[PDB]
Amino acid sequence: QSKAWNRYRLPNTLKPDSYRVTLRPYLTPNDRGLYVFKGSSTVRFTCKEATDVIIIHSKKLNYTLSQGHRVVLRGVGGSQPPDIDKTELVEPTEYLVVHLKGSLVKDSQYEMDSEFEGELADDLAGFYRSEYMEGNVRKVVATTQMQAADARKSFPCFDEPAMKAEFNITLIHPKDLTALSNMLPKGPSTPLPEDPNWNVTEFHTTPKMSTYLLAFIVSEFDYVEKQASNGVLIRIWARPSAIAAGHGDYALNVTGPILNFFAGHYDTPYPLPKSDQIGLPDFNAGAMENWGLVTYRENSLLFDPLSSSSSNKERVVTVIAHELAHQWFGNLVTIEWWNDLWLNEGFASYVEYLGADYAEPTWNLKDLMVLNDVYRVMAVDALASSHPLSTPASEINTPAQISELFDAISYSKGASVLRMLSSFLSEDVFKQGLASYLHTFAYQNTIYLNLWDHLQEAVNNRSIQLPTTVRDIMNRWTLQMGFPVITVDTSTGTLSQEHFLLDPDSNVTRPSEFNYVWIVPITSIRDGRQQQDYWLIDVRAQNDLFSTSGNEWVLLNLNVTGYYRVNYDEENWRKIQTQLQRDHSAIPVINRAQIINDAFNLASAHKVPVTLALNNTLFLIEERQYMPWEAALSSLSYFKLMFDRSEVYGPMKNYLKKQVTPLFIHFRNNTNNWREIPENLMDQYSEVNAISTACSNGVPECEEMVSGLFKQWMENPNNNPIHPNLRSTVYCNAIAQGGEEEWDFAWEQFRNATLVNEADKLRAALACSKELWILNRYLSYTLNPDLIRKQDATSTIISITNNVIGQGLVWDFVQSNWKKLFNDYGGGSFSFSNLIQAVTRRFSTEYELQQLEQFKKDNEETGFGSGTRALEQALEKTKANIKWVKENKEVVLQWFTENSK
Amino acid sequence: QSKAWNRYRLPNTLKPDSYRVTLRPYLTPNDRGLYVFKGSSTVRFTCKEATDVIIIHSKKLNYTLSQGHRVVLRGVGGSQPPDIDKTELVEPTEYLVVHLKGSLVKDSQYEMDSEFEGELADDLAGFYRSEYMEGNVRKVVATTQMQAADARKSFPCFDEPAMKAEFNITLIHPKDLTALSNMLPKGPSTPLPEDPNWNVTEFHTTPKMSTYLLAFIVSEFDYVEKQASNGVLIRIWARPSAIAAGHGDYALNVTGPILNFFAGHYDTPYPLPKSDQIGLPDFNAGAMENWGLVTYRENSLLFDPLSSSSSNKERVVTVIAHELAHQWFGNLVTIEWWNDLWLNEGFASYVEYLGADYAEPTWNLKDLMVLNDVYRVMAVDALASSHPLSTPASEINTPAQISELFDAISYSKGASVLRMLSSFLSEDVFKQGLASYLHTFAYQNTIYLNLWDHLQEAVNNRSIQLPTTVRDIMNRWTLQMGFPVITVDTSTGTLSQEHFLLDPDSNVTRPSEFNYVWIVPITSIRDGRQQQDYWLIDVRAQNDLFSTSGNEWVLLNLNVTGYYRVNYDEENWRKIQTQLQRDHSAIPVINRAQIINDAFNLASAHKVPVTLALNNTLFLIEERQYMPWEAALSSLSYFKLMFDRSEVYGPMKNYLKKQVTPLFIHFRNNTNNWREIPENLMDQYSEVNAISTACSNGVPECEEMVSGLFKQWMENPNNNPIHPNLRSTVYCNAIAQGGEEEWDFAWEQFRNATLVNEADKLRAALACSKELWILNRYLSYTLNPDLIRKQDATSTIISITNNVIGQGLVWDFVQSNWKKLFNDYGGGSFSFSNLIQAVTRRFSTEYELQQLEQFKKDNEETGFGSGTRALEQALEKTKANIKWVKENKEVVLQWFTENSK
Ligand SMILES: *[C@@H]1O[C@H](CO)[C@@H](O[C@@H]2O[C@H](CO)[C@@H](O[C@@H]3O[C@H](CO)[C@@H](O)[C@H](O)[C@@H]3O)[C@H](O)[C@H]2NC(C)=O)[C@H](O)[C@H]1NC(C)=O
Ligand SMILES: *[C@@H]1O[C@H](CO)[C@@H](O[C@@H]2O[C@H](CO)[C@@H](O[C@@H]3O[C@H](CO)[C@@H](O)[C@H](O)[C@@H]3O)[C@H](O)[C@H]2NC(C)=O)[C@H](O)[C@H]1NC(C)=O
Ligand SMILES: *[C@@H]1O[C@H](CO)[C@@H](O[C@@H]2O[C@H](CO)[C@@H](O)[C@H](O)[C@H]2NC(C)=O)[C@H](O)[C@H]1NC(C)=O
Ligand SMILES: *[C@@H]1O[C@H](CO)[C@@H](O[C@@H]2O[C@H](CO)[C@@H](O)[C@H](O)[C@H]2NC(C)=O)[C@H](O)[C@H]1NC(C)=O
Ligand SMILES: *[C@@H]1O[C@H](CO)[C@@H](O[C@@H]2O[C@H](CO)[C@@H](O)[C@H](O)[C@H]2NC(C)=O)[C@H](O)[C@H]1NC(C)=O
Ligand SMILES: *[C@@H]1O[C@H](CO)[C@@H](O)[C@H](O)[C@H]1NC(C)=O
Ligand SMILES: *[C@@H]1O[C@H](CO)[C@@H](O)[C@H](O)[C@H]1NC(C)=O
Ligand SMILES: *[C@@H]1O[C@H](CO)[C@@H](O)[C@H](O)[C@H]1NC(C)=O
Ligand SMILES: *[C@@H]1O[C@H](CO)[C@@H](O)[C@H](O)[C@H]1NC(C)=O
Ligand SMILES: *[C@@H]1O[C@H](CO)[C@@H](O)[C@H](O)[C@H]1NC(C)=O
Ligand SMILES: *[C@@H]1O[C@H](CO)[C@@H](O)[C@H](O)[C@H]1NC(C)=O
């Protein structure tokens, strides 16, 4: 509306300079059984424009009336404050509005004093609490998660990323609990005069930083410390039982070297004297990059060599690299507004791989970046209801809209765009431009224009030849949604580009200033030999680099560097298939995965027959590398979802049973009857994939093997005969093939689980049961925070709807209890989006579409929040599915039968 | 409305005397691929009241215009009929309306001739077609189903049970195809003058009989003939393959003696020269009682000693007895209108047991009457949406309502009421009154008052002392809904009665003139000794017969002869339980089944605790008789329906696994490791129940046993080692435990089955699969007439909704395609009533109730037809289930646990 307090965007009238925040958490429930933290705040601000009102962010904060009002106002340096008329708390916009009897003076400094109290709830937002068990005693830890808009919950502030200020933090805690914040404590802790049982810890002044990178923790966690080569002291904090077991050894091994590697790589030293990585039992997101105090989930930080798998090790190292990369991209240089979220996340989501590559040079995770980032986002970027990488700031106001931006789009598409940009700009020029950008905008806010300008300066300095300026090349990739599909006519060597859409009849409603045309850098190979690069500027082009004679074949997007899909004519497709059947090693592994994924996704978008996509998997019977198998399984996951409840699931499983039986058998010889694991990480991943694929599709040998392993474990509960890498999948199969007794054993083991990794494995496996009543009981369990933690609630439900039997249960449960689910659990976090996506991803029928439409209509008043666009996407996808199966069911079935023999 | 042709009931102005029907079926498709029949019929009728219009029944008939009109009127005995003004066909009331320019003369005879064409469709209604395969040759049979209001489909007629007439049937059939009707042919056949390839068979004039009993069958079936003792030729007709293998020998053995027994018992000789019993490949109901030509479903008549089970044999003898009893009750004496349908079906259901007991004296089938008739109908009779035994004639107008009356109420409650009547009148007086009633109203319609008058005459003649007249005693049971529950206070001996309702809240909209007060004949036993009979004519009474001192216990309703429930004080219930623990044999077997069933139904009525009802099943660990085990399993079926998708199913099965494990073991010793069967039928049934209960609740030895038997059959498809009594349970359990291979093998045997009994066993078993896609494929098959016959469609779907996995499947299928089912199978061979009852019996949540209400709201315009009232009942039951589960779930779950160990 016209009123200032009714607008979600903060007025640019006042600019904060420094805050003083004192916080006193109570870790013992009061007379009402409520955990309450009381605090005092003092915020100093400069008055840029004359105004009669002060608007600051305040969420769920009860203010103690002092001097007759909620807030006290004072001047600085002779400035006089006008008398306060009134104070009001506006819930819809979450704002503390202080109406004054006069007007402030321009270019003057004032201080604003507040006394407040709030709830130390278990919502994993703002200043919250996390509970764990030591022996038979409860322990409560007060921690923070101010991501997006939660800093307003802890204390009154100008909660916007562009409002940078220096914070003076003070924590009043129990005498026996250590207090941790962004900076090192200033002096030693002193007892509170009111009660000697309370300690007062005052920390140093933090540098110019945004309000969402603050962290206040009080806990008895212990730490393992080591001094990095760049003079930064790295400490790993966790529960005493976890640290005493050495679970933080790997994190301490990898944290320091990665930080020093980033500092040397970008020539920008880490400006903080210390870095504390602390694992929290309860944590919403994967991790948070608070400056100086990086908080993790316990599964992403702690690693037990005897019980954690190689996938857990990769997860730990990649998350550590991601959070340490956010130190430069997100903390030193922050976004002007969330709409440019890809500047932070995306950047980290790229360079995390670099960090991992330094920590584990023998793993080659940069190859896995293609499957984890590019083809992950390409699934949702092909929808007509997607959003550009840099949405205009006008469309993104509410906290829920801000939360939705944390989707696969930002992270994965930013990582893929930066990967393509570094590929065509070389790593040297890219990192030189990034270093110049980092030095120029330290402790400041940025937009994509500044990044393009600095990259253009680096290009000019290094004399790099590009068709146009960097800004014009990258505006095609940043300012419009989607990616181009590239059709190659090898008869004439003609290139055509067009906007790729999963549903050709879908109506794109978002206009693009470039009319959905991209300047595409093209890398091609001919008969396995690399060719000279090309630049597709126009809609259609002709060149002899893409013309074939005789048996020559050409492949575009070598190693999948560019962010685009590639389609060929039937001649070149047949040549590629012949090459694959003859000697598939002549094509790069990444290119084989690209071929499989691209064929399947083109078939889903009606560009090529589905028969071609299924034909491209006929060479898997002699393929041993992890990447093509993983790409094929991910592509066939769509078929599994589409036909798991139809007559096609019979032959299709058989077809898979034909393709995977050799690989399985091979690993039986390679692993020496499953007592050893392969040395290479790729081989371990492929072995797990082979076991799972052969074992879900009905190869009797794996069923007997997993049953024997689980019964052997059940005989000796303390000694686990299953190797950690093989644990998860075996568990799942052993619960699917077993009965009530196996489920009860697994549940009892999960209750006693001491490591979060084993607990997660068992929780994921418990949803694999094939009994309806067991699934119903499990679904009832997921809503009980005593049994299953709230952070793991929605995820668990997802596993339940991954089971074919539990799909209907989860859909009915969601339809019945959406009103309740919205209030808690997902709400406006980043989970609801996932639950909606997972529960509606099997819809292929007009009846299911009508059910989804009724679900949307019935919950208009309650709203969807962060799950809005995903729901929209679901609807679109459902329509596509209805048009797909009806067109492609029968033939697909036929094909599977013809190849099931 | 005011228009006569808009009223469903026929006018009383015209009364038919005789019909002459000539029918010519075309058993090959015409130029339009349609099976048609051409007919011509004349009707002689008397004009009781002067009318200017002739309203007759006509359905799906195309009339050739003769003399410018659809029909031609001629005078009889000098009468001069007025000329035809116009002829119209009103579809909603199915009337051919002939308007005349004048008015007919009162007490005058006229003749109406018509030539018509109809379709020989496969709807199993009217004149329809049944197709089978002999080798590779397709054979088509023209048969009839004229029950209810389907006699108008074949030829125009005054289609009402009160409009009796004499029929002259002529059938024009092919040269080599035999023709059969109600009467013997009137001389030998003659070739058709038009085409010598057609024969014209004219039959003798049928006696005064209702229109819905006509049968016209053209087929090449073969027969086995035998002359009964009463000089009536019994001929069993079936397909050549069935007769050649002697599948009709048992029917020949039992049919003649049962007819002779009925004739001797009721002193009324069979008034027709021959009785034909013909088995048809396609038939809606179990059988139909057409006078002289009794049509049966292949399973209700054919019996193979090698492959069929004793249950199949019992069905054959019973169905035969049911139809042979219908001959006296329904053909000789007919109901005035469908609202009094219990005079036909109730009497037939009661006398079928007498006939079967005569044919098979050692089976003791009469006891099963308690389980199959009384306790089956009490469940639907304890509802607020029930209907009385004798519904007012004004409430039954449309054909749909008539079909709805063919429900559990008419059949089973009539059987139970006549059982009580024979109980307190003694069999001698009962059969004397029945003989008088048959003699007086031969070839005439009747109402219940005539039956009461003749029974009162018999009572007065035999000097039987009753509290009041038979009319007043029996109008309580006939004209008002429901049954009473008698509460007994044994400390003082007080008896009270009240209208039994499963839901105390349920409101009874329909009023009762007697205010739901019954005159109850009560029989009691004290410590196993019979006491004097008592008559409860008031709501509350006191008598020392029902007062106990010390450990004395009293049971009411000995051998459940009366149609009422019994409740006791907690003391007497404990005394009964203690007896059952000490020596269960001291209580009669039927009374033990009564105890279990009444306790469970009172617990469901919130009159006694659920723990009591569950306690009464504790003695089953030492119970070997069939009736208590069957009653307990039937009662626990409701618990299984309520809790099979919840946490309670876990313990419940275990408790059953505890109870049935000894019995199963016992039979293993009795049957010598399952190579033999017990001599007694009841013991055979109990063995089947023990095997099924052990395998269903996860008793291992049963699982390995059934798996091994089915695997052995799989090795040798020709040699089936499973005994016919065990085949159904073995097939279902093996398909449940097995996988795709077992289901595929079973399907092949089903599509290559020769005996209907084997096909039914396999069709029932195929729905026991636990895989979702297999269930979807089977559900898709059920709608294909080529794979599963239409007559078996609904039942098969019901089987799928009996599977716990398939419940949501069938619910979604019904919700999506109600219109398709109510159109393609609309008003045809689809039993919507049974389908709704089966699909909606698991509903116990508010979300499911809302879904049911939305289902009702969506299809109001299309209507539910004969499944209307059942739908209402479902709704009522659904709400009652919600309350029962909410209050009993916790106590029930605990009880099972504390008794599962
Ligand atoms: C949070 O801490 C910062 C850093 O201590 C505070 O800024 C400091 O505020 C004090 C206020 O007295 C300043 O002291 C002044 O120094 C000038 C020096 O010329 C002197 O003329 C004045 O009389 C006065 O003593 C101090 O300079 C300033 N900065 C530093 C580096 O200490 C800030 O006010 C705190 N924010 C709060 C309380 O919200
Ligand atoms: C219909 O009734 C007839 C006669 O009541 C049944 O025929 C009888 O069948 C039994 C069983 O096969 C025969 O017993 C056998 O007799 C032979 C000697 O002939 C003996 O070697 C066998 O060990 C056995 O005891 C009985 O003789 C036979 N009677 C006649 C007159 O044929 C027939 O089985 C019934 N059909 C049914 C039940 O479907
Ligand atoms: C809470 O405050 C007390 C009192 O200051 C701290 O106890 C002192 O810890 C220092 C650590 O070097 C010792 O030298 C002193 O002797 C201790 N006692 C006193 C009276 O000073 C205590 O460590 C604080 N707890 C924290 C920081 O968690
Ligand atoms: C962290 O790094 C240290 C040193 O690189 C690792 O310690 C080595 O572990 C290997 C394997 O157990 C031994 O063979 C070496 O002798 C160890 N070296 C020293 C100096 O102790 C340690 O295992 C690493 N922690 C991890 C990977 O969790
Ligand atoms: C159709 O009618 C003809 C004529 O009556 C039947 O043919 C006679 O059949 C009898 C046996 O039923 C023979 O003894 C005669 O010699 C036949 N004569 C003639 C003139 O055909 C014929 O059998 C009938 N077909 C039936 C009843 O299916
Ligand atoms: C703040 O006040 C509201 C309303 O009085 C109350 O519901 C809430 O519990 C208070 N907050 C705390 C932390 O007590
Ligand atoms: C797939 O391969 C088969 C041979 O296995 C071939 O006949 C068919 O044409 C191929 N389909 C396409 C689309 O190339
Ligand atoms: C719980 O798990 C722990 C694992 O450390 C084990 O030592 C303990 O015996 C378990 N207790 C029970 C009751 O299962
Ligand atoms: C009767 O007439 C209607 C309308 O012409 C036609 O659709 C139907 O097929 C006819 N029935 C027969 C058996 O000829
Ligand atoms: C019953 O009627 C029969 C038939 O006439 C008669 O013989 C008999 O005496 C009657 N019984 C009486 C009147 O008690
Ligand atoms: C059922 O039996 C248990 C003991 O087996 C007893 O405690 C309970 O009271 C009984 N139920 C009733 C209703 O008496």
Closest CA to A45 of A153, A165, A203, A206: A165
Q: How far is CA B641 from CA A99, A385, A776, A812, B187, in A?
A: 64, 44, 15, 18, 60
State the Cα–Cα distance between residues B473 and B481, nearest whole angstrom: 15
- CA R_g for chain A: 28
Helix and strand totals (H; E) in chain B: 31, 31
Q: How far is CA A694 from CA A664, A687, B739, B842, in A?
A: 7, 10, 16, 37
Return the beta strands (E) in A377-463 as ranges: 444-446
State the Cα–Cα distance between residues A145 and A141, nearest whole angstrom: 13
Is B898 a catalytic site residue? no
**What residues does CATH 1.10.390.10 cover in chain B?**
339-479
Q: At what angle do helices A846-858 and B806-816 cross, to 10 degrees?
A: 90
Q: At what angle do helices A868-900 and A626-643 cross, to 10 degrees?
A: 100
Q: Cα(A18) to centroid of ligand 1, in Å? A: 10
Looking at chain A, after which residues does the C atom sit over 2.5 Å from the next written N, breaking the chain? Answer: none
Angle of CA points A154, A155, A161, to nearest 5°:
90
The number of the ligand 2 atom at minimal distance from the alpha carbon of B303 is: 39
Closest CA to B252 of B269, B281, B275: B275
Closest CA to A139 of A215, A236, A225, A240: A240
Smallest CA separation from ligand 9 atom 4, residue: B62
Burial class (CB in 10 A: 0-12, 13-18, 19+), A516: buried
Q: Which residues of A touch B643 (CB under 8 A)?
A: 773
State the Cα–Cα distance between residues B522 and B214, nearest whole angstrom: 43
State the Cα–Cα distance between residues A177 and A132, nearest whole angstrom: 15
Closest CA to A141 of A177, A170, A195: A177
State the Cα–Cα distance between residues A889 and B809, nearest whole angstrom: 20
CA A548 to chain centre: 42
Closest CA to A287 of A276, A300, A275: A300
Order of strands, sheet of A274-280, starting from the edge strand that comes earlier in the sequence: A222-227, A233-238, A274-280, A293-297, A287-288
Q: Token digits for B493?
A: 């001996």
Helix (H, G, I), strand (E, B) or coil at A137: strand
DSSP state of B366: G
State the Cα–Cα distance between residues B644 and B697, nearest whole angstrom: 12
User: A311: left (phi > 0), else alpha (psi -120 to 50), else beta?
Assistant: alpha
Q: The domain at A369-478 falls in which architecture?
A: Orthogonal Bundle (1.10)
The number of the ligand 9 atom at minimal distance from the alpha carbon of B117 is: 13
State the Cα–Cα distance between residues B534 and B514, nearest whole angstrom: 21
- For chain B, the distance separating the N- and C-terminal CA atoms, rounded to the nearest angstrom, is 68
State the Cα–Cα distance between residues B680 and B360, nearest whole angstrom: 12
Closest CA to A159 of A57, A89, A61, A40: A57
| Alpha helices by DSSP H, B398-426 | 399-405, 408, 414-425
State the Cα–Cα distance between residues B555 and B575, nearest whole angstrom: 11
- Residue A655's H or E segment, with its range, is helix A649-670
List Cβ neighbours of A194 (8 Å cut-off, separation of 6 or more).
none
State the Cα–Cα distance between residues B61 and B70, nearest whole angstrom: 11
State the Cα–Cα distance between residues A523 and A536, nearest whole angstrom: 11
Closest CA to B425 of B294, B519, B336, B521: B521
Q: Which residue is associated with the tokens 């490791």?
A: B673
State the Cα–Cα distance between residues B528 and B580, nearest whole angstrom: 12
Q: How many CB atoms lie within 10 A of CB A276?
A: 24
List Cβ neighbours of B306 (8 Å cut-off, separation of 6 or more).
B724
User: B292: left (phi > 0), else alpha (psi -120 to 50), else beta?
Assistant: left
Q: Which residue is associated with the tokens 């519904």?
A: B391
Topology (CATH level 3) of domain B339-479: Neutral Protease; domain 2 (1.10.390)
State the Cα–Cα distance between residues B263 and B548, nearest whole angstrom: 47
Topology (CATH level 3) of domain B484-592: Immunoglobulin-like (2.60.40)
Write the single-letter amino acid at B700: P
Relative to beta strand B333-335, strand B444-446 is: parallel
Q: How far is CA A452 from CA A343, A475, A515, A564, B42, in A?
A: 12, 9, 21, 21, 98
Answer whether A16 contacts ligand 6 (Cβ < 6 A).
no
Angle of CA points A426, A428, A432, to nearest 5°:
125
Q: Is the dihedral of CA A236, A240, A241, A245 positive or negative?
A: positive
Q: Is the dihedral of CA A376, A378, A379, A380 positive or negative?
A: positive
What are the beta bridge partners of residue A211?
none
DSSP state of B618: G
Closest CA to B348 of B406, B269, B277, B424: B406
What are the beta bridge partners of residue B119?
B36
List Cβ neighbours of A483 (8 Å cut-off, separation of 6 or more).
A378, A381, A382, A500, A518, A563, A564, A565
The number of the ligand 9 atom at minimal distance from the alpha carbon of B119 is: 13
Q: Cα(A615) to centroid of ligand 7, in Å? A: 6
Q: Is the dihedral of CA B642, B612, B616, B630 positive or negative?
A: negative
State the Cα–Cα distance between residues B833 and B848, nearest whole angstrom: 19
Q: Token digits for A711?
A: 């019964």
List Cβ neighbours of A715 (8 Å cut-off, separation of 6 or more).
none
State the Cα–Cα distance between residues B712 and B719, nearest whole angstrom: 9
Backbone angles phi, psi at A165, to 5 degrees: -160, 165
Looking at the complex, does the CB of residue B74 fall below 8 Å from at least one CB of chain A?
Answer: no
What are the beta bridge partners of residue A23?
A39, A171
Write the single-letter amino acid at B513: E
Backbone angles phi, psi at A459, to 5 degrees: -65, -45
Contact B613, B602 (CB under 8 A): yes
Q: Which residue is associated with the tokens 């003696």?
A: B257
Q: Which residue of B has its CA nearest to A774?
A: B647
Burial class (CB in 10 A: 0-12, 13-18, 19+), A279: buried
Angle of CA points B631, B636, B640, to nearest 5°:
150
Contact A248, A207 (CB under 8 A): no
State the Cα–Cα distance between residues B590 and A38, nearest whole angstrom: 73
Q: How many CB atoms lie within 10 A of CB A78?
A: 7
Q: Which residue is associated with the tokens 């790593």?
A: A427
The interface residues of chain A toward chain B in range 641-660, judged by CB-CB distance below 8 A, are 643-650
In three-state form (DSSP H/G/I as H, E/B as E, the rest C), the secondary structure along B477-531 is HHHCCCCEEEEEECCCCEEEEEECCCCCCCCCCCCCCCCCCCCEEECEEECCEEC
Helix and strand totals (H; E) in chain A: 30, 31
Q: Token digits for A817?
A: 């209890």
Is CATH 2.60.40.1910 the classification given to domain A484-578? yes
Q: How many CB atoms lie within 10 A of CB B870?
A: 24
The reply, when asked if residue A247 is annotated as ligand binding, is: no
Smallest CA separation from ligand 8 atom 2, residue: A752
Relative to beta strand A178-180, strand A190-191 is: unpaired
Q: How far is CA B374 from CA A506, B379, B562, B567, in A?
A: 61, 9, 9, 17
State the Cα–Cα distance between residues B751 and A191, nearest whole angstrom: 87
**What residues does CATH 2.60.40.1910 cover in chain A?**
484-578
Instruction: Write down the experimental method used for this entry.
Output: cryo-EM
Is B647 within 8 Å of A776 when comparing Cβ atoms?
yes
- CA R_g for chain B: 28
Relative to beta strand A95-100, strand A53-57 is: antiparallel
Backbone angles phi, psi at A752, to 5 degrees: -90, 5
Contact B753, B759 (CB under 8 A): yes
What are the beta bridge partners of residue B446?
B335
Answer whether A19 contacts ligand 1 (Cβ < 6 A).
yes
Closest CA to A272 of A320, A234, A329: A234
Residues in chain A: 901
Burial class (CB in 10 A: 0-12, 13-18, 19+), B78: exposed
State the Cα–Cα distance between residues A401 and A9, nearest whole angstrom: 13
Q: What DSSP string describes B757-778?
A: HHHHHHHHHHTT---HHHHHHH
Q: Token digits for B105?
A: 């003369």
Helix (H, G, I), strand (E, B) or coil at A783: coil
State the Cα–Cα distance between residues B821 and B826, nearest whole angstrom: 6
Which of A699, A772, A804, A858 to probe by mutation at the B interface, max B CB count within 10 Å?
A772
User: A844: left (phi > 0), else alpha (psi -120 to 50), else beta?
Assistant: alpha
State the Cα–Cα distance between residues B183 and B170, nearest whole angstrom: 11
Write the single-letter amino acid at B246: G
Contact A627, A367 (CB under 8 A): yes
State the Cα–Cα distance between residues A439 and A271, nearest whole angstrom: 12
State the Cα–Cα distance between residues B805 and B814, nearest whole angstrom: 15
What are the beta bridge partners of residue A287?
A296
State the Cα–Cα distance between residues B714 and A560, nearest whole angstrom: 52
Backbone angles phi, psi at B238, to 5 degrees: -160, 180
Closest CA to B750 of B711, B708, B796, B783: B796
Regarding the domain with residue range B1-219, which homologous superfamily does it belong to in the CATH classification? tricorn interacting facor f3 domain (2.60.40.1730)
Burial class (CB in 10 A: 0-12, 13-18, 19+), A133: exposed
Backbone angles phi, psi at A140, to 5 degrees: -115, 130
Q: Token digits for A185?
A: 């404590």
Q: How many CB atoms lie within 10 A of CB A755?
A: 20
Q: How far is CA B596 from CA A38, A103, A388, B612, in A?
A: 64, 86, 69, 10
Backbone angles phi, psi at B411, to 5 degrees: -55, -65
**What residues does CATH 2.60.40.1730 cover in chain B?**
1-219
Q: What DSSP string describes A689-700?
A: HHHHHHHHTT-H
Q: Cα(B7) to centroid of ligand 9, in Å? A: 26
Q: Token digits for B191?
A: 């070739």
The reply, when asked if residue A848 is annotated as ligand binding, is: no
Backbone angles phi, psi at A217, to 5 degrees: -125, 135
Q: What is the largest CA-CA distance in chain B?
A: 90
DSSP state of B374: I
Angle of CA points A102, A107, A108, to nearest 5°:
60
Contact A762, A299 (CB under 8 A): no
Q: What is the largest CA-CA distance in chain A?
A: 90
Closest CA to A283 of A312, A248, A319, A311: A319
Q: Token digits for A730?
A: 């075996």
Closest CA to B537 of B519, B516, B525, B517: B519
Which of A639, A649, A809 to probe by mutation at the B interface, max B CB count within 10 Å?
A649
State the Cα–Cα distance between residues B19 and B39, nearest whole angstrom: 13
Q: What DSSP string describes B82-141?
A: PPEEEEEEETTTTEEEEEESS-PPTT-EEEEEEEEEEE--SSSSEEEEEEEEETTEEEEE
**What residues does CATH 2.60.40.1910 cover in chain B?**
484-592
| Alpha helices by DSSP H, B605-752 | 610-615, 626-643, 649-670, 681-696, 700-715, 727-737, 740-751
Domain spanning A771-901 has what CATH number? 1.25.50.20
State the Cα–Cα distance between residues B598 and A612, nearest whole angstrom: 66
Contact B325, B262 (CB under 8 A): yes
Resolution in A: 3.0
**What residues does CATH 1.25.50.20 cover in chain A?**
771-901
| Alpha helices by DSSP H, A605-648 | 610-615, 626-643
CA B527 to chain centre: 38
Relative to beta strand A287-288, strand A14-25 is: unpaired
Is A773 within 8 Å of B816 when comparing Cβ atoms?
no
CA B82 to chain centre: 47
List Cβ neighbours of A901 (8 Å cut-off, separation of 6 or more).
none
